[PDB]
Structure formats: structure tokens, C-alpha cells
Design a protein around this ligand. Structure first.
Ligand code: MG
Ligand code: MG
Ligand code: MG
Ligand code: MG
Ligand code: MG
Ligand code: MG
Ligand code: MG
Length: 70
RNA sequence: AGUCAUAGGUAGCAGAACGUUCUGGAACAAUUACGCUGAAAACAGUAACAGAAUUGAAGCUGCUAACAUAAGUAACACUAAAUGGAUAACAUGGCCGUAAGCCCAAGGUUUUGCAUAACAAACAGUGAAUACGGUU
């Protein structure tokens, strides 16, 4: 609590002290899943969208950990 | 934008809104979204204005589907009996023997034969010639 409010720790810029993003929330995961199902249905497996989405899925991602319940 | 007044509720009555699908206003997601939070709630984060509704579900011993629990529990006790490193051909022992043997009928309709795994059902098999049963 003192680290949050009393000592001066969050006083630098944004480019310093920035964090990796939190992982995508479940609504956005469901939206992306629906988009991928749409793409594989009406555009095909061998499309640029499907292959690019798979290629972006295979690469690792730098994330944080959720601390709260939301 | 400063003072006051009111705000427990079942049945019931009244008012304001959220969300789902579709349509009109030319087209509001081709190449996605993803700072993770905001809001009093229903919720929001891919328009808005109107309209048409098979428009909102823990709650009907409701229906359908999937998955648990009981639980690796109960069961695998009607019988003759098995043994040799094999559901053995060989050897030993046992059981039925008015049957648990043999020949047919009704019914079934290929359930019938072949490979020391295998690639095998995709392959075979039912012969009227004794005055056999039927058909008359
Ligand atoms: Mg009241
Ligand atoms: Mg009161
Ligand atoms: Mg339109
Ligand atoms: Mg209805
Ligand atoms: Mg056992
Ligand atoms: Mg034996
Ligand atoms: Mg017969």
C-alpha cells in the first residue's frame, strides 16, 4: 500500500515503466475466433487471411499476468 | 449546479431503459480484433434514426444431447473337472449315455470352409441317378 501511494515510484515517463500488455480478454478472443471461422468458411484454408492468421498465431507473444478478477 | 422535500415492500398499477434476429434510409467488418478497462443495473468495447418480431430462461417429477456420481462398486455361483509352459492333434482323468448321442420338422436364412495375425472376404460351398419331399 505504501508502494502504491506514499513512496515516489511511478514518476518517470510512459516509455520507461511501460509493461507488456495483458492477454486478450475473453470477449476479444471470441470475436477473433468468430472472424477466423468466417474466414475459413467463405475464403478457404489456403487464403492469405487464413495463412497470415496461422502465422501470427504460431509466433510467441510477450504478455503479463492478470492480477484481478476481470 | 445552490438550498430544501421524498426514496421498506408481496399481489397489483404506472414511468424510464438494456439486449437478440430481420428490414427501410446508396453501401457501417475485403485487408479482423487484441493499451483493459467503463457504466447504477440490464451490459458495453464494429454506426445512428425508425420499423417487424417464432425477442431474453436455474426454476413446468418439461423434451433432446453430452458428461459425471454411486464405482472400478455390484455382477461375471444352475450344471460334469480338469492336468501336462497351447481353449492342442498326443497322453492322463472325469461327465451324459432314453442324453449333453444320431436323423428330421417348424423357425432362422449364409450364421457353413480356408491363413502357426493375416492384406481373408474381395474367395469358396448346397449336384435327385433308387419309383427322396413337394407340385397332382
Ligand atoms: Mg420503494
Ligand atoms: Mg425510509
Ligand atoms: Mg440498410
Ligand atoms: Mg418463444
Ligand atoms: Mg477387480
Ligand atoms: Mg489343455
Ligand atoms: Mg430348414
Amino acid at each position: 500500500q505504501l508502494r502504491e501511494h506514499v513512496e515516489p515510484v511511478g514518476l518517470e515517463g510512459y516509455r520507461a515503466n511501460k509493461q507488456p500488455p495483458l492477454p486478450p480478454r475473453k470477449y476479444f478472443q471470441e470475436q477473433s475466433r468468430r472472424w477466423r471461422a468466417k474466414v475459413l468458411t467463405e475464403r478457404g484454408v489456403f487464403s492469405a487471411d487464413a495463412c497470415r492468421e496461422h502465422a501470427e498465431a504460431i509466433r510467441p507473444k510477450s504478455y503479463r499476468r492478470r492480477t484481478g478478477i476481470r
